[PDB]
A paper describes a structure:
Here we have investigated the potential of macrocyclic peptides as another alternative class of TNF binders. Said system has allowed the discovery of M21, a high-affinity binder to TNFα capable of inducing dissociation of the trimeric state of the pro-inflammatory cytokine TNFα, a relevant clinical target, to an inactive dimeric form.
The structure shows the M21 peptide bound to a dimer of TNFα subunits (A and B) interacting with residues from both A and B and with an average interface area of TNFα and M21 of 231 Å2 (compared to 398 Å2 for the TNFα subunit interface). The side-chains of the M21 loop 2 (residues L6, V9 and L10) make contacts with the B subunit. The only hydrogen bond observed between bicycle and TNFα (in both copies of the complex) is formed between amine group of W7 in loop2 and the hydroxyl group of Y119 side-chain in TNFα subunit B. No other intermolecular hydrogen bonds or salt bridges are observed, suggesting that the high-affinity interaction is largely driven by hydrophobic/van der Waals interactions and shape complementarity. The disassembly of TNFα trimers by M21 might occur either by induced TNFα trimer dissociation or by stabilization of a transient dimeric form. The latter is more consistent with the slow time-dependent effect of M21 action and with the inability of M21h to bind the stably trimeric transmembrane form of TNFα (tmTNF).
Numbering used by the authors:
A (entry chain A): 8 to 157
B (entry chain B): 10 to 31, 36 to 105, 111 to 157
C (entry chain E): 1 to 12
Write the structure that this text describes.
Amino acid sequence: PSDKPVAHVVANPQAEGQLQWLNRRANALLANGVELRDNQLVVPSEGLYLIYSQVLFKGQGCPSTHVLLTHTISRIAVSYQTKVNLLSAIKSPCQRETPEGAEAKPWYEPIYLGGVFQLEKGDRLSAEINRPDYLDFAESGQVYFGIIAL
Amino acid sequence: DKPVAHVVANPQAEGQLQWLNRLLANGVELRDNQLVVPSEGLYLIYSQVLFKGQGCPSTHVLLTHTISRIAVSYQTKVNLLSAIKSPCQRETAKPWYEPIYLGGVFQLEKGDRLSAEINRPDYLDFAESGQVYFGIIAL
Amino acid sequence: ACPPCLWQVLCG
Ligand SMILES: *Cc1c(C)c(C*)c(C)c(C*)c1C
């Protein structure tokens, strides 16, 4: 008997080149009012929430130094249909291009985001990335998005 | 009232990540380096580890950290949260540092066992105190 | 001992 709204969704590994969130695969959940609509989490009541997510990027070799990975969680209000970033990070996994002389070493970069925010009833929350081509869901527990009311 | 636990690395232990015993209250126990959940319900689970290395010997270096669950019903290990990191950019002596932090909310069953593990305990860093840890909190 | 982290708000 936990009456607090809460949610934990995971990437659909069958979706190719897309960050698609899924509910209730084993070890995922939507509880006490929280809903997944249009790939967003919909908040059922006004209040303070911890919001979090992780993504994992993987690349085979580094052909340009200028690769840029981003991950951001944003919020849209029912009152204003306008998007505001709550948490965002940026990462550049490459410091030197592969000297072709060398050959195809994989790199891995995780980004975890989390924090506490006042949200309003009906707010919609998105966790998005710039490069779904570089996403890695070869395994469970690598990519997820959740919230917990305080 | 609500079960909770926060364990920390034993810095004495060489070549494994050993969580320190008896911190952990209200039914939660540490058995066989795992946290044992005393009641079914929703839990926040979390952990952090810190890796430290001298120079980049070869870019082949991979760090992993993962939290898994074994259901008393399932008796099979399932990953809940997991991350991978490769620190050795522009690899061959400059020291490097890499943290990995994991956390999220899960429905667990009474008797479930939770593990927080890594692949390279040789690269663990205990120089920053209280910063390698593993915990849970019932909601 | 107990440094700041993203979840601490839920444990007091
Ligand atoms: C001491 C401590 C720390 C460092 C964290 C991150 C959490 C989540 C909790 C509950 C506690 C007690």
